[PDB]
Design a protein around this nucleic acid. Sequence first.
RNA 1: GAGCUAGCCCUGGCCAGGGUGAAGCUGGGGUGAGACCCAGUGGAGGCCCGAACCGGUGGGGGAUGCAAACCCCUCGGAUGA
RNA 2: GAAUGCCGGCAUGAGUAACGAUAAAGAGGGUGAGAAUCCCUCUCGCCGUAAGCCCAAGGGUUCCUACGCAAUGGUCGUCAGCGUAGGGUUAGGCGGGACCUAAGGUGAAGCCGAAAGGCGUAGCCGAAGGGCAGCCGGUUAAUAUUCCGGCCCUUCCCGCAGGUGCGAUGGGGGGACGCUCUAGGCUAGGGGGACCGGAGCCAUGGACGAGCCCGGCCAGAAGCGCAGGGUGGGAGGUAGGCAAAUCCGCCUCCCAACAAGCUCUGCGUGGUGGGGAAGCCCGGGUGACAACCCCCCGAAGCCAGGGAGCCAAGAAAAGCCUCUAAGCACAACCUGCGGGAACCCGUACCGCAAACCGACACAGGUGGGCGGGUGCAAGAGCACUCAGGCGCGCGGGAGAACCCUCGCCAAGGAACUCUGCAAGUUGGCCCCGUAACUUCGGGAGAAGGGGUGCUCCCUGGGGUGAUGAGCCCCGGGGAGCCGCAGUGAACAGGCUCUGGCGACUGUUUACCAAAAACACAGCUCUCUGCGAACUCGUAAGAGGAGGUAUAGGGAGCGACGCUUGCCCGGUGCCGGAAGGUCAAGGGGAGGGGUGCAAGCCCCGAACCGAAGCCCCGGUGAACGGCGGCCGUAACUAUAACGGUCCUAAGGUAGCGAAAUUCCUUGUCGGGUAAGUUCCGACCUGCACGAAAAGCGUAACGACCGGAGCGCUGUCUCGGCGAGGGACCCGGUGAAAUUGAACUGGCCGUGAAGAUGCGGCCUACCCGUGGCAGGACGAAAAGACCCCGUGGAGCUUUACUGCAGCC
RNA 3: CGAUGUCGGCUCGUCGCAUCCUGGGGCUGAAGAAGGUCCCAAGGGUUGGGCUGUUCGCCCAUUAAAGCGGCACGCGAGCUG
RNA 4: UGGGAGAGGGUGGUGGAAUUCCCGGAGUAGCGGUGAAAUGCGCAGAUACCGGGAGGAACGCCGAUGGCGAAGGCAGCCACCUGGUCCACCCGUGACGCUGAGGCGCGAAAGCGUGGGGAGCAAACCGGAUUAGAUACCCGGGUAGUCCACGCCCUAAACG
RNA 5: CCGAGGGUAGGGCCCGUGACUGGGGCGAAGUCGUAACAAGGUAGCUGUACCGGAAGGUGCGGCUGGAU
RNA 6: GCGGGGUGGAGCAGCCUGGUAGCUCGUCGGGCUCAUAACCCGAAGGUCGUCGGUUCAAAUCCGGCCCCCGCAACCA
Lengths: 275, 48
Amino acid sequence: AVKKFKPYTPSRRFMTVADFSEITKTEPEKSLVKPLKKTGGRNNQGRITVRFRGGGHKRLYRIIDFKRWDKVGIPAKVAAIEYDPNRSARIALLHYVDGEKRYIIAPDGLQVGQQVVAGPDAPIQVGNALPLRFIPVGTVVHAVELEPKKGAKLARAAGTSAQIQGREGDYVILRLPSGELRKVHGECYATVGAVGNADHKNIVLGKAGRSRWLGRRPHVRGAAMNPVDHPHGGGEGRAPRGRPPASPWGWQTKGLKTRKRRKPSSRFIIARRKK
Amino acid sequence: MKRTWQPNRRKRAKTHGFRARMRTPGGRKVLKRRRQKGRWRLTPAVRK
RNA sequence: GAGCUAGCCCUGGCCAGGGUGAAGCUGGGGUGAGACCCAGUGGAGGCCCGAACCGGUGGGGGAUGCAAACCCCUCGGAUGA
RNA sequence: GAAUGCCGGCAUGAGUAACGAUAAAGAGGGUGAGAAUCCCUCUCGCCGUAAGCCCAAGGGUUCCUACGCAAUGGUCGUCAGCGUAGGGUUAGGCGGGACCUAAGGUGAAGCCGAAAGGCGUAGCCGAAGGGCAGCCGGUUAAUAUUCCGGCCCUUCCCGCAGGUGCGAUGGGGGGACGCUCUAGGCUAGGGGGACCGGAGCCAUGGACGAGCCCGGCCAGAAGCGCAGGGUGGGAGGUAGGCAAAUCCGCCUCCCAACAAGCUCUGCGUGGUGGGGAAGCCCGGGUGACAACCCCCCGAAGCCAGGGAGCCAAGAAAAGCCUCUAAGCACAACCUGCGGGAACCCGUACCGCAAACCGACACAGGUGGGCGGGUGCAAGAGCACUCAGGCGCGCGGGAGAACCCUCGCCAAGGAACUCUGCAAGUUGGCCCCGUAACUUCGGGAGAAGGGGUGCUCCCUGGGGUGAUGAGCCCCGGGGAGCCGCAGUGAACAGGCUCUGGCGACUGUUUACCAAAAACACAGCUCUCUGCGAACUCGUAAGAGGAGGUAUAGGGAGCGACGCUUGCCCGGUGCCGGAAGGUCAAGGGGAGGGGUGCAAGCCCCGAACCGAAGCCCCGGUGAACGGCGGCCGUAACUAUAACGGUCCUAAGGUAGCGAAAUUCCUUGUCGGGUAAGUUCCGACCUGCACGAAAAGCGUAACGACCGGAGCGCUGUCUCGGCGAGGGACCCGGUGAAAUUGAACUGGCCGUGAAGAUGCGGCCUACCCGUGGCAGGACGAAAAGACCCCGUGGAGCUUUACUGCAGCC
RNA sequence: CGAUGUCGGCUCGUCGCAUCCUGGGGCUGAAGAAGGUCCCAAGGGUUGGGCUGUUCGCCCAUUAAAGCGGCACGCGAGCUG
RNA sequence: UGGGAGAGGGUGGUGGAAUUCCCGGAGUAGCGGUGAAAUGCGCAGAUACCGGGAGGAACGCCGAUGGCGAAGGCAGCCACCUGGUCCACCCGUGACGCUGAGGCGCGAAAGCGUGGGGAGCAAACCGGAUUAGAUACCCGGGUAGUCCACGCCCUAAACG
RNA sequence: CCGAGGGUAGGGCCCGUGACUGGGGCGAAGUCGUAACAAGGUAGCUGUACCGGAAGGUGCGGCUGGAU
RNA sequence: GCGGGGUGGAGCAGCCUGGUAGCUCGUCGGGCUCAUAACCCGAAGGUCGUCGGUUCAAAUCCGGCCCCCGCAACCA
Ligand SMILES: *C(=O)[C@H](CCSC)NC=O
Ligand SMILES: [K+]
Ligand SMILES: [Mg+2]
Ligand SMILES: [Mg+2]
Ligand SMILES: [Mg+2]
Ligand SMILES: [Mg+2]
Ligand SMILES: [Mg+2]
Ligand SMILES: [Mg+2]
Ligand SMILES: [Mg+2]
Ligand SMILES: [Mg+2]
Ligand SMILES: [Mg+2]
Ligand SMILES: [Mg+2]
Ligand SMILES: [Mg+2]
Ligand SMILES: [Mg+2]
Ligand SMILES: [Mg+2]
Ligand SMILES: [Mg+2]
Ligand SMILES: [Mg+2]
Ligand SMILES: [Mg+2]
Ligand SMILES: [Mg+2]
Ligand SMILES: [Mg+2]
Ligand SMILES: [Mg+2]
Ligand SMILES: [Mg+2]
Ligand SMILES: [Mg+2]
Ligand SMILES: [Mg+2]
Ligand SMILES: [Mg+2]
Ligand SMILES: [Mg+2]
Ligand SMILES: [Mg+2]
Ligand SMILES: [Mg+2]
Ligand SMILES: [Mg+2]
Ligand SMILES: [Mg+2]
Ligand SMILES: [Mg+2]
Ligand SMILES: [Mg+2]
Ligand SMILES: [Mg+2]
Ligand SMILES: [Mg+2]
Ligand SMILES: [Mg+2]
Ligand SMILES: [Mg+2]
Ligand SMILES: [Mg+2]
Ligand SMILES: [Mg+2]
Ligand SMILES: [Mg+2]
Ligand SMILES: [Mg+2]
Ligand SMILES: [Mg+2]
Ligand SMILES: [Mg+2]
Ligand SMILES: [Mg+2]
Ligand SMILES: [Mg+2]
Ligand SMILES: [Mg+2]
Ligand SMILES: [Mg+2]
Ligand SMILES: [Mg+2]
Ligand SMILES: [Mg+2]
Ligand SMILES: [Mg+2]
Ligand SMILES: [Mg+2]
Ligand SMILES: [Mg+2]
Ligand SMILES: [Mg+2]
Ligand SMILES: [Mg+2]
Ligand SMILES: [Mg+2]
Ligand SMILES: [Mg+2]
Ligand SMILES: [Mg+2]
Ligand SMILES: [Mg+2]
Ligand SMILES: [Mg+2]
Ligand SMILES: [Mg+2]
Ligand SMILES: [Mg+2]
Ligand SMILES: [Mg+2]
Ligand SMILES: [Mg+2]
Ligand SMILES: [Mg+2]
Ligand SMILES: [Mg+2]
Ligand SMILES: [Mg+2]
Ligand SMILES: [Mg+2]
Ligand SMILES: [Mg+2]
Ligand SMILES: [Mg+2]
Ligand SMILES: [Mg+2]
Ligand SMILES: [Mg+2]
Ligand SMILES: [Mg+2]
Ligand SMILES: [Mg+2]
Ligand SMILES: [Mg+2]
Ligand SMILES: [Mg+2]
Ligand SMILES: [Mg+2]
Ligand SMILES: [Mg+2]
Ligand SMILES: [Mg+2]
Ligand SMILES: [Mg+2]
Ligand SMILES: [Mg+2]
Ligand SMILES: [Mg+2]
Ligand SMILES: [Mg+2]
Ligand SMILES: [Mg+2]
Ligand SMILES: [Mg+2]
Ligand SMILES: [Mg+2]
Ligand SMILES: [Mg+2]
Ligand SMILES: [Mg+2]
Ligand SMILES: [Mg+2]
Ligand SMILES: [Mg+2]
Ligand SMILES: [Mg+2]
Ligand SMILES: [Mg+2]
Ligand SMILES: [Mg+2]
Ligand SMILES: [Mg+2]
Ligand SMILES: [Mg+2]
Ligand SMILES: [Mg+2]
Ligand SMILES: [Mg+2]
Ligand SMILES: [Mg+2]
Ligand SMILES: [Mg+2]
Ligand SMILES: [Mg+2]
Ligand SMILES: [Mg+2]
Ligand SMILES: [Mg+2]
Ligand SMILES: [Mg+2]
Ligand SMILES: [Mg+2]
Ligand SMILES: [Mg+2]
Ligand SMILES: [Mg+2]
Ligand SMILES: [Mg+2]
Ligand SMILES: [Mg+2]
Ligand SMILES: [Mg+2]
Ligand SMILES: [Mg+2]
Ligand SMILES: [Mg+2]
Ligand SMILES: [Mg+2]
Ligand SMILES: [Mg+2]
Ligand SMILES: [Mg+2]
Ligand SMILES: [Mg+2]
Ligand SMILES: [Mg+2]
Ligand SMILES: [Mg+2]
Ligand SMILES: [Mg+2]
Ligand SMILES: [Mg+2]
Ligand SMILES: [Mg+2]
Ligand SMILES: [Mg+2]
Ligand SMILES: [Mg+2]
Ligand SMILES: [Mg+2]
Ligand SMILES: [Mg+2]
Ligand SMILES: [Mg+2]
Ligand SMILES: [Mg+2]
Ligand SMILES: [Mg+2]
Ligand SMILES: [Mg+2]
Ligand SMILES: [Mg+2]
Ligand SMILES: [Mg+2]
Ligand SMILES: [Mg+2]
Ligand SMILES: [Mg+2]
Ligand SMILES: [Mg+2]
Ligand SMILES: [Mg+2]
Ligand SMILES: [Mg+2]
Ligand SMILES: [Mg+2]
Ligand SMILES: [Mg+2]
Ligand SMILES: [Mg+2]
Ligand SMILES: [Mg+2]
Ligand SMILES: [Mg+2]
Ligand SMILES: [Mg+2]
Ligand SMILES: [Mg+2]
Ligand SMILES: [Mg+2]
Ligand SMILES: [Mg+2]
Ligand SMILES: [Mg+2]
Ligand SMILES: [Mg+2]
Ligand SMILES: [Mg+2]
Ligand SMILES: [Mg+2]
Ligand SMILES: [Mg+2]
Ligand SMILES: [Mg+2]
Ligand SMILES: [Mg+2]
Ligand SMILES: [Mg+2]
Ligand SMILES: [Mg+2]
Ligand SMILES: [Mg+2]
Ligand SMILES: [Mg+2]
Ligand SMILES: [Mg+2]
Ligand SMILES: [Mg+2]
Ligand SMILES: [Mg+2]
Ligand SMILES: [Mg+2]
Ligand SMILES: [Mg+2]
Ligand SMILES: [Mg+2]
Ligand SMILES: [Mg+2]
Ligand SMILES: [Mg+2]
Ligand SMILES: [Mg+2]
Ligand SMILES: [Mg+2]
Ligand SMILES: [Mg+2]
Ligand SMILES: [Mg+2]
Ligand SMILES: [Mg+2]
Ligand SMILES: [Mg+2]
Ligand SMILES: [Mg+2]
Ligand SMILES: [Mg+2]
Ligand SMILES: [Mg+2]
Ligand SMILES: [Mg+2]
Ligand SMILES: [Mg+2]
Ligand SMILES: [Mg+2]
Ligand SMILES: [Mg+2]
Ligand SMILES: [Mg+2]
Ligand SMILES: [Mg+2]
Ligand SMILES: [Mg+2]
Ligand SMILES: [Mg+2]
Ligand SMILES: [Mg+2]
Ligand SMILES: [Mg+2]
Ligand SMILES: [Mg+2]
Ligand SMILES: [Mg+2]
Ligand SMILES: [Mg+2]
Ligand SMILES: [Mg+2]
Ligand SMILES: [Mg+2]
Ligand SMILES: [Mg+2]
Ligand SMILES: [Mg+2]
Ligand SMILES: [Mg+2]
Ligand SMILES: [Mg+2]
Ligand SMILES: [Mg+2]
Ligand SMILES: [Mg+2]
Ligand SMILES: [Mg+2]
Ligand SMILES: [Mg+2]
Ligand SMILES: [Mg+2]
Ligand SMILES: [Mg+2]
Ligand SMILES: [Mg+2]
Ligand SMILES: [Mg+2]
Ligand SMILES: [Mg+2]
Ligand SMILES: [Mg+2]
Ligand SMILES: [Mg+2]
Ligand SMILES: [Mg+2]
Ligand SMILES: [Mg+2]
Ligand SMILES: [Mg+2]
Ligand SMILES: [Mg+2]
Ligand SMILES: [Mg+2]
Ligand SMILES: [Mg+2]
Ligand SMILES: [Mg+2]
Ligand SMILES: [Mg+2]
Ligand SMILES: [Mg+2]
Ligand SMILES: [Mg+2]
Ligand SMILES: [Mg+2]
Ligand SMILES: [Mg+2]
Ligand SMILES: [Mg+2]
Ligand SMILES: [Mg+2]
Ligand SMILES: [Mg+2]
Ligand SMILES: [Mg+2]
Ligand SMILES: [Mg+2]
Ligand SMILES: [Mg+2]
Ligand SMILES: [Mg+2]
Ligand SMILES: [Mg+2]
Ligand SMILES: [Mg+2]
Ligand SMILES: [Mg+2]
Ligand SMILES: [Mg+2]
Ligand SMILES: [Mg+2]
Ligand SMILES: [Mg+2]
Ligand SMILES: [Mg+2]
Ligand SMILES: [Mg+2]
Ligand SMILES: [Mg+2]
Ligand SMILES: [Mg+2]
Ligand SMILES: [Mg+2]
């Protein structure tokens, strides 16, 4: 439910922020936070290996439970819903009746003070985790393991979901957030419901400064550089690409498919992505 | 204006120091070369 | 060789004073309920003016210099990328 | 004898420039061989959010003292950061270590790499972060939170008493966190006192005063008081915190819940210990039995881990507390008291600078804290001034040109010039007032104006206090006074109209470009299903991301508005299990060598045989591209219309002599006395055009145009004046350059521009201040240009390789 | 080419004369006035503006007249840029 | 008070037919289209047929000359929430009425903003025909849009 | 003090005029096509959108003032 | 300067490879129509820009002159 601003500055004219209404707890669980180590896109060689990053707000990483088969049959109460600066999704606090506390990512509609549970015999209610094979065909679902007991890998971003489409053998068939049709093993867990905070994409950063707060350093166009730097470098005055549009490293960047062809997972992808 | 030499005893010792030299193959050759030449000091003076 | 300089990481510090007056909140009006309007409150902002601080626009001087880039006048930013 | 040779030595320029901020000096008295320069006194000027004080880094004896002046000091020197020598730096509490972790670094396990080595969880290392016990004064020539004095405190060891299930590297709590705004109460600091203490002072016309001048505190355990911070208590269950657990987490029940209580900090008080001015004497004495009090202002600091709001969501680990586990419960720990024990390193001095970084005692650079008073709305701004600290290590004269920095200027007022460049103007505050347009915020300080001092009188409100006085802070009204002038000094916008470009704040070529360039929110295309794609790396391993398609990579475009047309023939990319081509390999018609022969050996056709290519499609916010000629209307002219050739298709909307228009100052209109620029139009657009986006667009701009008002020394057109130089005298004393020089004009000649040749003319010898026509003056072995089968960056459908990928 | 700095402006001139003006003439299709055209003459003079980097040119308002050219398209160890 | 008819409205959910596409099968030389054709699709295996899958949109028969609403308009089925309206009884208030400048709300399609969705259809657009031309009518394609949500637009042969 | 009015500055309404530009009315015998009136040879009309030398065409929905 | 062109009335083939001129439109006669267009049937018209050369023979190949279209005209 994105908030607008009056144009009392040039940048407030367009800037929009999240409403934060669902958030019920404005400081994290101390037992569940650890320092997020900023990299700046630099690897253990010290080299920038992902460009244009750094200088973002300091963050604490909130440990999220991407297993949940960890605790079959033990119900938890939804103590709170909290801000997580490491994701687009909001996170939910779970007070397990175990007395154990854990974070999961908050599905849409999950209300604070409700109960959730995980396991083969869990109800089909928003917030619950089941192996895929026990979730009714047609059910919208998020936080999906790609392989059994390996961790939730699919559909974690704000507002996202995967829909179960049908089954084949030990496998079920998902339509991913991307629209790809993939077979995923039936013993893979997933949580019923779509990820919450769907209005996330309607946010209008509004000014250069917000990108900077997110650790996003300014991206500089190839066309703006010199031949030593980029295929699109140089030219007298402005210049069109003058060759197939390319990356800094020379490979073509308008249409060139890059999925490794002989990849074993090919046997499991039914249909490549949507739009 | 601000010039290029900005002394820093810790910086000097950790960068050109004996122990930094001994850790690296190129650094040992330095000591070896400076010994062979007969340098009075193998490593920059710095008071620590 | 990154004690200059460029980017990033970690940990600290700094930003006189003045001006403008967003949302929200309260009250009042309004209406079926509302939207909404008015006052007060409030104190937002790569908001305004202007020291420190960071700059280096125009002009003058300097030109075997005070200086291998400086000095004077003027000017830019000054809670922010 | 030449190599712009090399090393050295010494000349020339020259007693020349200069002597390093224009904050500034003068005199007296000392010392001494010698004094503008050292010491002392008085007078004068300068800084005073520093040019004062404290810490940090860096420096490393430079500190203090004696004795010295050859060199160092831009002069001098008796002086010195200089020479010689002697002395000087004292800690359980300050800083660091014997504590903790951050990035990072290292690295038992493990992984990888021809070697060297690379990586790597834990662990270790790593600080200006966490944690941890000292304050005030006195003392030395020089150290002091260090020595001394006073009053405090910490840890370790051992002992005694009391208490308790004691015990950890393990479990848990806590430590523990942002930005902005901010409440209460304090303290730092400051203002005032008709009160308290003080040596005095009465001047020059007046004042012996409720007069002047000076000062009126600092630290302090326990207790107490004020203000705050932190914190529920009890019970039952328990599968979770990788063993255990009474702890913690979760569930329920009682009680206490804006508290109280317990606790911990700040501030006040506090036994007590200190300190204590001017002035006058000789750093010291005196003052002095010093006094040590009241009121006001009041922090950004303290209580603090306070409160509120916001989104971008804000370290770790130890100390500490609690829980237990092996163990041990003659132990062990907790509390209190006592005695003992308590190590290593730093500590001098400079520290916005003459001691650091700049080759210099260099107008530059250098992080943190304190930074007093008055007045100007405020303030760290500005002027003056306190404490303190300085007059910048050449001086004395002179009173030219000219240069710099500065002040003024009759009449005119941009006529200057590429350009109002520069310099004027304007300038703070209060009040009145304020347009087009607009995204409704703005434009806006629009524009424009009026007020501003002082005195007397009347009065409204707030803080403190008490509800009053006093002090303090906002104001209101009336009557007056003076000057040319009242933000009387200093600090402190010129304005408007209209275009182009870029939305905007930002960013940039350190040291000739700050822009229209880069970035930017936003728009689109495209890749990527996660051991992601992509990137770095031989690899392992990292980044991506402890992220998961509302995500991440790459690319173009660049807020927003209204929009973004046609061409897929070529190139690219995407799709296509047919076909064609295609290497190694398979196959083996069939030949060849050799051997007596079995055999050994070699060649070899059809045929099966991948990707790539061909071929078949698709695809433009992929690379890109978007015609020619001829004719036609009832005046003329022009063609809505037609003919035909070509193409993959012939440029749509919008815009247009434009940041694009060659002809060009196109033509017409506007503005001007006059307009190659400007603005508005027209359209035969040499050679706009739609995300290398098209056309607009409020706001913004140290961007680039055009105009006007204001006002000016820009100019007509110059004048005068000030200071620093230039000039003269004393001191110190460079430089580039230089074949040698006894170095004139003209007209000729000459390798074609002659002081140097010819002829003629002119000319006594030598300087000083000036000016720049020549010495094809200096500087730099021309950057332009060419040449070299010279070099380097860059590009591609140049060649040939290689990585990578298939 | 081991360097001979370039347009235009400014400043400062100096020279030529194929004379723009002023002085002196002859011829005229010279009535006067005013012109044409040629001759002599370089002594002096030869303006201020708008446009443009401009020289040049055009234009405004004047003038006796608004001359042309050389001096490294005179002059950057004189300035501008 | 008691009753009735109804595509009146909003929300949530759900069923079958058909189309398109994908997968498997079986199968061969054309399909498709028109006035006739061509473009297009098809031996790289199309069409026609069977089984499987995904998705969107519209609801055949009932269905009417019908019903509802103030108008625009509303049609599978289910449930919830809700408006209007008619009838009966003759029970209650006792003229509380009519109209209505302004105002406010609703308002087909198209259109617009932001997300989503996208089978069929289809402005624009391309191609094949026709024609003197054919920027048309006809044919093969095809982008918005048509659909959902929120927010605008507020027009009409909004007509009886 | 007020005060005619003068001056400075900024606004509002109106009128005239303006390179050029936009459609409009009219104009005996121009050019192009043939949209409408017959089912006008694609029934027409319509609001709206888009497109095209032009009339128009086409989409979506509506109307009969539509032939049969 | 380099490249390409000139041919019935209009716009284009033929040139390369010598002997041959062709396509659409226009024009002319006829037809259909009441009439015109459209349409249908027949027909005329070039002598290849020009001059000179090569050859038995020149639109065709070589050279010149004339035009037209395009591209270039750069470095100080
Ligand atoms: C030519 O103009 C040249 C300038 C060099 S531009 C790189 N100078 C010649 O003397
Ligand atoms: K060049
Ligand atoms: Mg923790
Ligand atoms: Mg590393
Ligand atoms: Mg390394
Ligand atoms: Mg990268
Ligand atoms: Mg961030
Ligand atoms: Mg960019
Ligand atoms: Mg570039
Ligand atoms: Mg560039
Ligand atoms: Mg490089
Ligand atoms: Mg390249
Ligand atoms: Mg390029
Ligand atoms: Mg370029
Ligand atoms: Mg270009
Ligand atoms: Mg460029
Ligand atoms: Mg391009
Ligand atoms: Mg190109
Ligand atoms: Mg690749
Ligand atoms: Mg440094
Ligand atoms: Mg150091
Ligand atoms: Mg260091
Ligand atoms: Mg070392
Ligand atoms: Mg040495
Ligand atoms: Mg030695
Ligand atoms: Mg060494
Ligand atoms: Mg650095
Ligand atoms: Mg450094
Ligand atoms: Mg900080
Ligand atoms: Mg400060
Ligand atoms: Mg600031
Ligand atoms: Mg402030
Ligand atoms: Mg504010
Ligand atoms: Mg600001
Ligand atoms: Mg400057
Ligand atoms: Mg200036
Ligand atoms: Mg210089
Ligand atoms: Mg020199
Ligand atoms: Mg200044
Ligand atoms: Mg300023
Ligand atoms: Mg500020
Ligand atoms: Mg400012
Ligand atoms: Mg010789
Ligand atoms: Mg030499
Ligand atoms: Mg040599
Ligand atoms: Mg030498
Ligand atoms: Mg000499
Ligand atoms: Mg002399
Ligand atoms: Mg001399
Ligand atoms: Mg000198
Ligand atoms: Mg000097
Ligand atoms: Mg004196
Ligand atoms: Mg002396
Ligand atoms: Mg002396
Ligand atoms: Mg002295
Ligand atoms: Mg002061
Ligand atoms: Mg030193
Ligand atoms: Mg000496
Ligand atoms: Mg001496
Ligand atoms: Mg001596
Ligand atoms: Mg000396
Ligand atoms: Mg000396
Ligand atoms: Mg010196
Ligand atoms: Mg002496
Ligand atoms: Mg001590
Ligand atoms: Mg020890
Ligand atoms: Mg450690
Ligand atoms: Mg270390
Ligand atoms: Mg520390
Ligand atoms: Mg911290
Ligand atoms: Mg300590
Ligand atoms: Mg002391
Ligand atoms: Mg005991
Ligand atoms: Mg215990
Ligand atoms: Mg413990
Ligand atoms: Mg934390
Ligand atoms: Mg904030
Ligand atoms: Mg105190
Ligand atoms: Mg005060
Ligand atoms: Mg006092
Ligand atoms: Mg005393
Ligand atoms: Mg005494
Ligand atoms: Mg035991
Ligand atoms: Mg025992
Ligand atoms: Mg105990
Ligand atoms: Mg020890
Ligand atoms: Mg000390
Ligand atoms: Mg400092
Ligand atoms: Mg000093
Ligand atoms: Mg020194
Ligand atoms: Mg140096
Ligand atoms: Mg000095
Ligand atoms: Mg200095
Ligand atoms: Mg005053
Ligand atoms: Mg002030
Ligand atoms: Mg001085
Ligand atoms: Mg000074
Ligand atoms: Mg001096
Ligand atoms: Mg002097
Ligand atoms: Mg003199
Ligand atoms: Mg004057
Ligand atoms: Mg004027
Ligand atoms: Mg004037
Ligand atoms: Mg002017
Ligand atoms: Mg100008
Ligand atoms: Mg100026
Ligand atoms: Mg002024
Ligand atoms: Mg407005
Ligand atoms: Mg004003
Ligand atoms: Mg006065
Ligand atoms: Mg001022
Ligand atoms: Mg100002
Ligand atoms: Mg222009
Ligand atoms: Mg900009
Ligand atoms: Mg820019
Ligand atoms: Mg733009
Ligand atoms: Mg814009
Ligand atoms: Mg740039
Ligand atoms: Mg630069
Ligand atoms: Mg440069
Ligand atoms: Mg440099
Ligand atoms: Mg500059
Ligand atoms: Mg530039
Ligand atoms: Mg700028
Ligand atoms: Mg955009
Ligand atoms: Mg690589
Ligand atoms: Mg990670
Ligand atoms: Mg991205
Ligand atoms: Mg932009
Ligand atoms: Mg950009
Ligand atoms: Mg761009
Ligand atoms: Mg607009
Ligand atoms: Mg194409
Ligand atoms: Mg293609
Ligand atoms: Mg194609
Ligand atoms: Mg193949
Ligand atoms: Mg493109
Ligand atoms: Mg092309
Ligand atoms: Mg005609
Ligand atoms: Mg078009
Ligand atoms: Mg269009
Ligand atoms: Mg034009
Ligand atoms: Mg023009
Ligand atoms: Mg152009
Ligand atoms: Mg030209
Ligand atoms: Mg032009
Ligand atoms: Mg031009
Ligand atoms: Mg013109
Ligand atoms: Mg003109
Ligand atoms: Mg005019
Ligand atoms: Mg211009
Ligand atoms: Mg024209
Ligand atoms: Mg492009
Ligand atoms: Mg371009
Ligand atoms: Mg524009
Ligand atoms: Mg604008
Ligand atoms: Mg604009
Ligand atoms: Mg700007
Ligand atoms: Mg600017
Ligand atoms: Mg400007
Ligand atoms: Mg002057
Ligand atoms: Mg003077
Ligand atoms: Mg000397
Ligand atoms: Mg000689
Ligand atoms: Mg001689
Ligand atoms: Mg000659
Ligand atoms: Mg000569
Ligand atoms: Mg001679
Ligand atoms: Mg001779
Ligand atoms: Mg001679
Ligand atoms: Mg002579
Ligand atoms: Mg002299
Ligand atoms: Mg002289
Ligand atoms: Mg000279
Ligand atoms: Mg000269
Ligand atoms: Mg001179
Ligand atoms: Mg000369
Ligand atoms: Mg030079
Ligand atoms: Mg050389
Ligand atoms: Mg050379
Ligand atoms: Mg050179
Ligand atoms: Mg040359
Ligand atoms: Mg060669
Ligand atoms: Mg050669
Ligand atoms: Mg070469
Ligand atoms: Mg070369
Ligand atoms: Mg090369
Ligand atoms: Mg030369
Ligand atoms: Mg030379
Ligand atoms: Mg030279
Ligand atoms: Mg030169
Ligand atoms: Mg006459
Ligand atoms: Mg006469
Ligand atoms: Mg004559
Ligand atoms: Mg004359
Ligand atoms: Mg003359
Ligand atoms: Mg001119
Ligand atoms: Mg000329
Ligand atoms: Mg001209
Ligand atoms: Mg006359
Ligand atoms: Mg002449
Ligand atoms: Mg010439
Ligand atoms: Mg000349
Ligand atoms: Mg010159
Ligand atoms: Mg010059
Ligand atoms: Mg010049
Ligand atoms: Mg010269
Ligand atoms: Mg010269
Ligand atoms: Mg076959
Ligand atoms: Mg009744
Ligand atoms: Mg009514
Ligand atoms: Mg509607
Ligand atoms: Mg609609
Ligand atoms: Mg067609
Ligand atoms: Mg026809
Ligand atoms: Mg009807
Ligand atoms: Mg009057
Ligand atoms: Mg018709
Ligand atoms: Mg019709
Ligand atoms: Mg018809
Ligand atoms: Mg019809
Ligand atoms: Mg047409
Ligand atoms: Mg159409
Ligand atoms: Mg041919
Ligand atoms: Mg008849
Ligand atoms: Mg006929
Ligand atoms: Mg012949
Ligand atoms: Mg012939
Ligand atoms: Mg032939
Ligand atoms: Mg060139």
